């Protein structure tokens, strides 16, 4: 109820058949704008802001209760679960992958697909494992983040985007901006210090593991690692696209391949 005014819920479209487009890190979903369109006839598309989106009151981002992914999976299929949605095909963009992969487990009939777009289980490496990331790295990441925000942005925004498309980077960071620097940091701590590898094997469902080329925070290997992890029948799609937001960056090329994979 408040909840689906809380998260921004919306529902378009005019099918049976219901999707759930779910947007990650440093966004709205808003990121889905460029996408929608193309399911409307087909879908009822469910659409939400997890609770740090910038677009969301800051007053309801708990920092006692948002410590791990569990309670964002809880708001996830409370939503569902308000709306009557007992089926569903779900694309989750970034952390929204693994709150997919934590819901899926918990309500093993609730999805008939995950798909998974610039997903990673866990950034860190180590001696058996390459994430993309060493401890180092992420500890300049968060002092700069909080040593200046809009510095950090400015610098992220085009990494993320990655491909040559500087009205994306804009559009990427003034969703950046819109969230509060303290929320973004403590969510980033949140998303870096995850490591959902132990559980991947527990999901049952179908996966398409969406993986562009060169994301700047999921190593082409990562996929791989998805791919032979989860625990049902994965594939994994290469797009030929550049960079960690293809919703935003190429659009229609991400269209073409989510209709395919839900097809």
């Not at 919306?10 to 709205?28: N, P």
């Not at 802001?49 to 920092?63: E, K």
């Not at 001696?127 to 925000?149: L, R, T, W």
């Amino acid at each position: 109820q408040t909840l689906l005014d809380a998260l921004n819920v919306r529902v378009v479209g005019s099918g049976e058949r219901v999707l759930v487009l779910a947007h990650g890190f440093g966004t709205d979903q808003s990121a889905w704008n460029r996408i929608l369109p193309f399911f409307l006839r087909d879908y009822r598309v469910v659409l939400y802001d997890l609770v740090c989106a910038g677009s969301v009151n800051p007053d309801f981002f708990d920092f006692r209760r948002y410590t791990t992914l569990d309670p964002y999976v809880d708001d996830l299929l409370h939503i569902l679960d308000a709306l009557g949605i007992d089926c569903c095909a779900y694309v989750g963009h970034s952390v929204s992958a693994m709150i997919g992969i934590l819901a899926s487990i918990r309500r093993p009939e609730l999805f008939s697909k995950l798909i998974l777009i610039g997903a990673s289980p866990r950034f860190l490496n180590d001696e058996d494992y390459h994430g993309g990331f060493e401890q180092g790295e992420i500890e300049k990441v968060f002092s700069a983040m909080e040593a200046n925000y809009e510095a950090w942005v400015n610098g992220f925004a085009p990494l993320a985007v990655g491909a040559d498309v500087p009205a994306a980077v804009r559009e990427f960071s003034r969703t950046l901006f819109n969230m509060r620097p303290d929320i973004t940091l403590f969510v980033s701590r949140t998303v870096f210090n995850s490591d959902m590898r132990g559980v991947l094997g527990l999901v049952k469902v179908p996966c398409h593991i969406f993986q562009t080329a060169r994301d700047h925070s999921v190593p082409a290997s990562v996929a791989t690692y998805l791919k032979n992890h989860l625990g049902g029948k994965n594939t994994v799609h290469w797009l030929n696209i550049e960079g960690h937001l293809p919703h935003l960056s190429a659009p229609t090329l991400l269209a073409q391949e989510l209709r395919r994979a839900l097809s």
